[PDB]
Amino acid sequence: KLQKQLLEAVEHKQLRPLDVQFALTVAGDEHPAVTLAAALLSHDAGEGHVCLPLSRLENNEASHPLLATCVSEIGELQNWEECLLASQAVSRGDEPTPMILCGDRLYLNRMWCNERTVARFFN
Amino acid sequence: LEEDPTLTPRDIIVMVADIDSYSPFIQAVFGSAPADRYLPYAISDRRARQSHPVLEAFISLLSLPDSRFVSEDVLALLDVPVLAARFDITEEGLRYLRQWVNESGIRWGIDDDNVRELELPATGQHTWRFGLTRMLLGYAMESAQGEWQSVLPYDESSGLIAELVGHLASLLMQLNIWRRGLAQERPLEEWLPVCRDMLNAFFLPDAETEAAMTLIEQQWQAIIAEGLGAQYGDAVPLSLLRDELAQRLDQERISQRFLAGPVNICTLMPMRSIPFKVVCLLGMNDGVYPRQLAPLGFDLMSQKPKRGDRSRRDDDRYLFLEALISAQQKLYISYIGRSIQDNSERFPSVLVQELIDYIGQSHYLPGDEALNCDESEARVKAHLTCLHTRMPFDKAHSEFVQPLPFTLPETVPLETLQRFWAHPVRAFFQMRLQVNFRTEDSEIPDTEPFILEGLSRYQINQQLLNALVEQDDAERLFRRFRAAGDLPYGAFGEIFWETQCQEMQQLADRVIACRQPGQSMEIDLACNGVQITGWLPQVQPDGLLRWRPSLLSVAQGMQLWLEHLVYCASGGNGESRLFLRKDGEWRFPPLAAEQALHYLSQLIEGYREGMSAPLLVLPESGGAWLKTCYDAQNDAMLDDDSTLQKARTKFLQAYEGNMMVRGEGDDIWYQRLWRQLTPETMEAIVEQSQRFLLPLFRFNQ
Amino acid sequence: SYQLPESLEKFTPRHPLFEAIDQLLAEPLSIRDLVITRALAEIRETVAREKRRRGELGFDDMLSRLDSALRSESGEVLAAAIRTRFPVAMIDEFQDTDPQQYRIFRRIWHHQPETALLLIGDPKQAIYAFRGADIFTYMKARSEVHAHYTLDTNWRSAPGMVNSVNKLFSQTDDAFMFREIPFIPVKSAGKNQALRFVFKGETQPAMKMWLMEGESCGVGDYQSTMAQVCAAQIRDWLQAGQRGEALLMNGDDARPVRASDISVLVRSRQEAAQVRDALTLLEIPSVYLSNRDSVFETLEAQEMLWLLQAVMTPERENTLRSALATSMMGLNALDIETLNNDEHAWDVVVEEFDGYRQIWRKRGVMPMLRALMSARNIAENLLATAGGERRLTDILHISELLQEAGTQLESEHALVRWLSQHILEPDSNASSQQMRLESDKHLVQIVTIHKSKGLEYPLVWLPFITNFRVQEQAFYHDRHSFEAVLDLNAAPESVDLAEAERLAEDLRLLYVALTRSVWHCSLGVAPLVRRRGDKKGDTDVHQSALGRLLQKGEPQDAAGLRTCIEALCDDDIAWQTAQTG
Amino acid sequence: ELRGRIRSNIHELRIACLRETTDNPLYERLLEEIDDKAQAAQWLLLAERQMDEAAVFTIHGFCQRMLNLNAFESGMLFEQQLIEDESLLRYQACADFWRRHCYPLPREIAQVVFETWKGPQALLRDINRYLQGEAPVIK
Amino acid sequence: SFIWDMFVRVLPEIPKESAFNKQSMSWKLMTLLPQLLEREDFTLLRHYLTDDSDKRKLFQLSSKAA
Incomplete structure (x- = not known):
């Protein structure tokens, strides 16, 4: 799959091997779009990002033909919200899941607690 | 060398029968x-140890697929600085790795596929994959x-730090x-680049390492060159090549510093005879x-002994005589007697x-010149x-x-007194x-x-008990553990x-039968002109109630005693209780504030003297001696000589350990003060126990 | 309980359920009988298969391999070469043999004349039942061989002692519970007949029992009275012989008694604290030679671990003052108090470890253990302080133990990990035991029976000869085939056979104990009862070894035991009562 | 000790045979039984110098020196590394067994197992004494 | 080596090193022995090796024979 390509990207130093580990261990054999999403969110978390809009990661497509590789699953996967929610590694905020999406933004769940409490503090 | 004026250290030689076992002492x-x-x-014929950790690590990697990969062996591999620098591992992070692999629960083999390969049932936990999953979900x-x-x-x-x-x-x-790669049998022409691939895949070369890399590459090339040229x-398989490499690598030796100039240590080479003045064995x-x-x-030479044959036995027998005749001045012969x-x-x-x-049988001493041949021989x-x-x-020590x-500060915390009184010796x-x-x-x-067993199951019992007093569920907590x-x-867990x-239910229901809603309170009271500040947590308004899943001990009860003293100092009428396992119970009645301050003054002066000199207050053995001697009916001291041996017996049998209890004397805090218990210090300990702990049995009920 | 059909006159069956209930009760229900065998096969199989992939070898495996090579068809060819090479065999101390080894010997040398075989051993002194040594193979061999010879001379002990030990074992025939070990009398030597032991003029009886006073007694009384009594008599001998009162002469050439010529023999270890404390209460030097304790148990290992840790990490104040606070540096409260407040004197000790760690890295293990030994000059400190030689010798022994690891290992983390690794596990290796601090001068020796084989002593005591412990584990040999057959279910017949074998072993122990006393030895005896109710008239002395020698399997009491003691009491054996003094 | 005593005995016997006058009665009766003193002395001279390789062994050493002499029938390796800490190996093996024969067992079956003993450590401690040596026949 | 140098100097048409070396006959015996087995004279080696082997005993025998 993508393990050799992302090891090559680690040799390219664009994406951290820690991001590779996080994406591998919470993806396994799930959707490749979910794997790339986990890798990029772990990458910006290692950068120090706090928010992550879906449009930015969608139109980045830094390493791979994202659309032409991701379109393999059931139905219209372009509706990315429940396309991700089909996977077991994300939840809307009901279960103790590492991945939570609230405002069309996908990020870490402790960071989701912090971001939702400051978002309800702000707006 | 002091006795003779001039003798060069070049002209002294010491041989040895066996070199490797003798070498570390020399x-x-x-x-x-x-x-x-x-x-x-100048030691000669030393075993070749050029890059010892690198050679041992590479041999361990070449012994990969037959090992169950214990975490101890994994970290004993990981300790190598070259591998640490290549895989950017630092010594300060090595401690974090040590504690995390010790406490996160990584004990068994590498992965469940290996576990199933060893025909064992798939546990599904306690692997490196399980530990990394634990670590990454903790990160998340x-x-x-x-x-x-x-x-x-x-x-x-x-x-x-992740x-x-x-x-x-x-x-x-x-x-x-x-591990997947190095299992299958291969021919020699693709066994050839495996060593090169391993070297470049694992090790970043350092300034010194290239000698070891050249040794490994040359030995690998020579082995497979011999194999290929032998058609x-x-x-x-890999095992034969691994053992052949391990045998051939350490077969090299050093014979390069024979005549450096200082004294020389070497084994007895065959036929080697050099004139010298001093020879020692x-x-x-x-x-x-x-x-x-x-x-x-299956040898056939030994069946037909001809002229030109060579035996190691006769070779050593000839070398001994050659070494004897190759000496000029002195001979030094010694053996383990x-x-x-x-x-x-x-x-x-x-x-x-x-x-x-x-x-x-050759000579005679000058003393008894004509006494007897055999007696002179024995005398010589x-x-x-x-x-x-x-x-x-x-x-002497x-x-x-x-x-x-x-000095006596005017403001002292309660926690200082509690920590001092928990164990004054330490x-x-x-x-x-x-x-x-x-x-x-x-x-x-x-x-x-x-x-x-021990502290782990004690923590499990405590976590069960603090939910049992709330009567919350145990099944979710069982799933969590x-x-x-x-x-x-x-x-077996169930x-x-x-x-x-x-x-624990029989301990829980007793606490439920008298639990009351209470509150915390802050102690601000003075004694002997010394203000005492402290926080008393969770005190019920109608008394006291503490509980702890432990066996009964005098030091445990004296904490409740001090708690009742500081509770009665702040007014505080009512009794006090403590619950333990096997329904052990303690009960202390309230008293006068002046009497409470008097006992607190006694304890304060005891602490004041104990800080200046280490006052000997044994809480359990002294209590065992003092309890049976005291009689609760008369509230006085029996001093019959019949009990003067029962007290000795019970005090000794409580101090020195049994085969089931840890020895109280087996504690380095007490071992530092003396090596052996003395009766005079015993009497002093009895005196301090009678001076201090005796109010406890006066009010225990 | 009442489903026995005989209970009609006690408390007709008339239906088969009332006797099928006891049929069900007669068979115990457990899974251990299956799981023990199922595990026992596979553990041995798995170990024997796992050793193959490493190619190692063991003493147990080597003899089994040789036996299997005999079991193969080429055994005749394999034995012919051995017969040609060695047409003789001699075996010493034959009492420790296994049926495997005897099968090898029998197969190689049970035939084929011009080749002989000489076996030398003893049916007695076979005290290695837990060392894989079987006694029944000796009788199995004797049922095939038919030449028996016995020596007569002794060369060591007094003729009176020889006569007494002949008489006391000549009480009842075949006393060893076996018709294959008949004790026959032996004679003394003609040059030791002038050996005498006097006490204020006249001589002394060689053998002597000491007896409790009371209808019943327990193990606590057995220890408390007799340890004090034995210590009192040892003190009496020690005080008397120092003034030339009691003497040990062979004819006329006499000498006084000292500490070295006085020893004691015991059974186990847990009892020995009582004997040591009772002996040292009268200020007598006692050393326990039977100890095989690892040196890693003592506090010297802890202090060495702390010193190596502090010299590896000399940065923090706490880890350095931990090393300086140890007893071996030898400081005081004022010393530490001045060391805390003086920054310059603190920094001197900080700076010396900075160079010491570099010397450690450059030089290994041993030279720094020599250098820190020499620099603080703590040899003379422990020489001046009494009892410090025991603390001193363990440091040198630990240093010699560290050299086998300091070369094969190089990482400084590995050695300090290794020391704490061996702290928690006291391995029973022979090199791990403690060396003797003073084996040079006159002390008092306390040794057990198992190490007492072959060592001669002038005089010796024996306090604990009456006590015994009943076996309860099902393990017995057949009375005909002599095969060690193990029974899972509790069979009382097998239990009785095992108890008879255990009693034979205890009598062999008694024969071992009543030797190696050239002048005199003595012991005590009690009418101890294992039963709960005391005064029933049924003592339990005959259950032990010595009780069978006097009661011959009779329930007796103090009066009958007294009559049995004084029946044979004549001028070589002398009896005495013992009071708690 | 036996080898040294043997060497001292043969040396003293050779000297006493060359001097024809002894002190020990055993050597005296042997010298009485001597047929040819010169032949006996020659044999003792040729035997004393061969002492260094004489056959005195333990059982393990004897079989070790015999199998490496004739190991064709055995089929064992020529050179091996000995070992003594087999207790840790047996402790690993018993726990390895206890993993596979207790974990898939149901609760009602395993309850009786839990009653009689808990751990494989105690299981090994119970049955260790019969593992070494020869396995016994089970009634 | 000196005698080999004299051989090279005097006797012609001989290579500088022979094909008979302590490691050469190891692999030569490795190749030869299974082919040479069952010749009605290798029954001892057949009993030694044919029971079970992963060429370890064969390698040891090859080195000793070399």
Whole structure:
């Protein structure tokens, strides 16, 4: 799959091997779009990002033909919200899941607690 | 060398029968020689150790797929600085790795596929994959929510120090890939680049390493070159090549510093005879010289002994005579005479026995010139033999305790008194002169826990008890500890849980039968002109109620005693109670505030004297001595001589340990003060116990 | 309980359920009988298969391999070469043999003349039942061989002692519970007949029992009275012989008694604290030679671990003052108090470890253990302080133990990990035991029976000869085939056979104990009862070894035991009562 | 000790045979039984110098020196590394067994197992004494 | 080596090193022995090796024979 390509990207130093580990261990054999999403969110978390809009990661497509590789699953996967929610590694905020999406933004769940409490503090 | 004026250290030679076992002692003493009595040396025929950790690590990697990959062996591989620098592992992060692999529960093999390969049932936990899953879910999220795929998060890593996790992960996938690779049999022409691939895949070369890399590459090239030039075509497994490499690598030796100039140490090379003035020999016991090598069994030369044959036995017998005739001035012959363990008898070799027999039958001492041939022979044998001793050495320490000055602050915390009174003997050391015995971190456990004992099961019992007093569920907490991996696999966890909960229920319902809603309160009271400040947590308004899953002890009860004293100092009418296991109970009645302050003053002066000099207050053995002697009916001191032996018996049997209880005397805090218990210190301890602990039984009920 | 059909006159069956209930009760229900065998096969199989992939070898495996090579068809060819090479065999101490080894010997040398075989051993002194040594193979061999010879001389002990030990074992025939070990009398030597032991003029009886006073007694009384009594008599001998009162002469050449010529023999270890404390209460030097304790148990290992840790990490104040606070540096409260407040004197000790660690890295293990030994000059400190030689010798022994690891290992983390690794596990290796601090001068020796084989002593005591412990584990040999057959279910017949074998072993122990006393030895005896109710008239002395020698299997009491003692009491054996004094 | 006593005995016997006058009665009766003193002395001279390789062994040493002499029938390796800490190996093996024969067992079956003993450590401690040596026949 | 140098100097048509070396006959015997087995004279080696082997005993025998 993508393990050799992302090891090559680690040799390219664009994406951290820690991001590779996080994406591998919470993806396994799930959707490749979910794997790339986990890798990029772990990458910006290692950068120090706090928010992550879906449009930015969608139109980045830094390493791979994202659309032409991701379109393999059931139905219209372009509706990315429940396309991700089909996977077991994300939840809307009901279960103790590492991945939570609230405002069309996908990020870490402790960071989701912090971001939702400051978002309800702000707006 | 002091007796003779001029003799060059070039002109002294010492041979030895066996070199490798003798070498560490020679090197140690010749490196530990003093300043003026120093003389250099030059050891020859040392075993070749050029890059020892690198060679051992590469041999361990070449022994990969047949190992179960214990975490101890993994870290004993990981300690190498070259691998640490290549896989960017730092020494400061190595401690974090040590504690995380010790506490996160990584004990068994690498992965469940390997476990199933070894035909064992798939446990599904306690692997490196399980530990990394634990670590990464701890990085992702806290351990308060629960479980995501029935594995427990591990909140010891949630910061920027988490890079070592991915480093170790990359290391373990490299190990997994090469474990898959290095199993199948291959022919020689593709066994050729495997060593090169391993070297470039693992090791970043350093300034020194290239010698070791060249040695490994040259040996690999030579082995497969011999194989290819010998015209073999079939595939061969990895084990034969691994053992051949391991045998051939250490077969190299050093014979490059024979005549450096200082004194020389070497084994007896065959036919080697050089003139010298001083020749010394070592280790001529029986059974070690000459070394006996039996023929292989199918030899035909040994059946027909011809003229030109060579035997190792006769070679050594010739070398001894050649070494004897190759001496000019002095000879130094020594052997191990008596075994040092049981003082039994050993014997010198037959060659030395023949030499001393010829010497004894050769000459006579000048004393008894005409007495008897055999008596003169025995006298010469006794005179020439020298006998050494077993030990080379064939102000005193004072009493450790000394008086010290100390001041009395007007404001002291309650926690200071509690920590002092918990164990005063070690409290004198741990806080006054700022010394404590910071023991090194323990070993990583070998396998998964079968039974639970000690502090772990004590913490489990405490976590069960603080929910039992709330009467909340036990099943979710049981699932949480099963995800923690602190319970036996399968239904044995439920079997253990049933016994633990049914045993703690009888402690729980007693607390429920008298639990009342209380509150915390802050102590601000003075005694002997000394203000005492402290916080008293969770005190019920109608009395006191404490509970703890532990066995009953006098030091445990005296905490409740001090609690009741400080409670009665702040007004505080009502009794006090404490619950323990086996329904052990304590009861203290309220008293006068002046009496409470009097007892507090007594304890304050006791602390004041104990801080200046380490006052001996044994809480349990002294209590055992003082309890049976005291009679509760008269509230006085019996002093009958009949009890003067029962008290000795029970005090000794409580102090020194049994086979089931840890020895109270087996404690380094007490071992530092003295090596052996003395009756005078016993009487002093009895006196201090009678002076201090005696109010406890006056009001225990 | 009442389903026995005989209970009609006690408390007709008339239906078969009332006797099928006892049929069900007669068979115990357990899974251990299956799981023990199922595990026992596979553990041995798995170990024997796992050793193959490493190619190692063991003493147990080597003899089994040789036996299997005999079991193969080429055994005749394999034995012919051995017969040609060695046409003789001699075996010493034959009492420790296994049926495997005897099968090898029998197969190689049970035939084929021009080749002989000489076996030398003793049916007695076979005290290695837990060392894999079987006694029944000796009788199995004797049922095939038919030449028996016996020596007569002794060369060591007094003729009176020889006569007494002949008489006391000549009480009842075949006393060893076996018709294959008949004790026959032996004679003394003609040059030791002038050996005498006097006490204020006249001589002394060689053998002597000491007896309790009371209808019943327990193990606590057995220890408390007799340890004090034995210590009192040893003190009496020690005080008397120092003034030339009691003498040990062979004819006329006499000498006084000292500490070295006085020893004691015991059974186990847990009892020995009582004997040591009772002996040292009268200020007598006692050493326990039977100890095989590892040196890693003592506090010297802890201090060495602390010193190595502090010299590896000399940065923090706490880890350095931990090393300086140890007893071996030898400081005081004022010393530490001045060391805390003086920054310059603190920094001197800080700076010396900075160079010491570099010397450690450059030089290994041993030279720095020599250098820190020499620098602080703590040899003379422990020489001046009494009892410090025991603390001193363990440091040198630990230093010699560290050299086998300091070369094969190089990382400084590895050695300090290794020391704490061996702290928690006291391995029973022969090199791990403690060396003797003073084996040079006159002390008092306390040794057990198992190490007492072959060591001669002038005089010796024996306090604990009456006590015994009943075996309860099912393990017995057949009375005909002599095969060690193990029974899972509890068979009382097998239990009785095992108890008879255990009693034979205890009598062999008694024969071992009543030797190696050239002048005199003595012991005590009690009418101890294992039963709960005391005065039933049924003592339990005959259950032990010595009780069978006097009661001959009779339930007796103090009066009958007294009559049995004084029946044979004549001028060589002398009896005495013992009071708690 | 036996080898040294043997060497001293043969040396003293050779000297006493060359001097024809002894002190020990055993050597006296042997010298009485001597047929040819010169032949006996020659044999003792040729035998004393061969002492260094004489056959005195333990059982383990004897079989070790015999199998490496004739190991064709055995089929064992020529060179091996000995071992003594087999207790840890047996402790690993018993726990390895206890993993596979207890974990898939159901609760009702495993309850009786839990009653009689808990751990494989105690299981090994119970049955260790019969593992070494020869396995016994089970009634 | 000196005698080999004299051989090279005097006797012609001989290579500088022979094909008979302590490691050469190891692999030569490795190749030869299974082919040479069952010749009605290798029954001892057949009993030694044919029971079970992963060429370890064969390698040891090859080295000893070399």
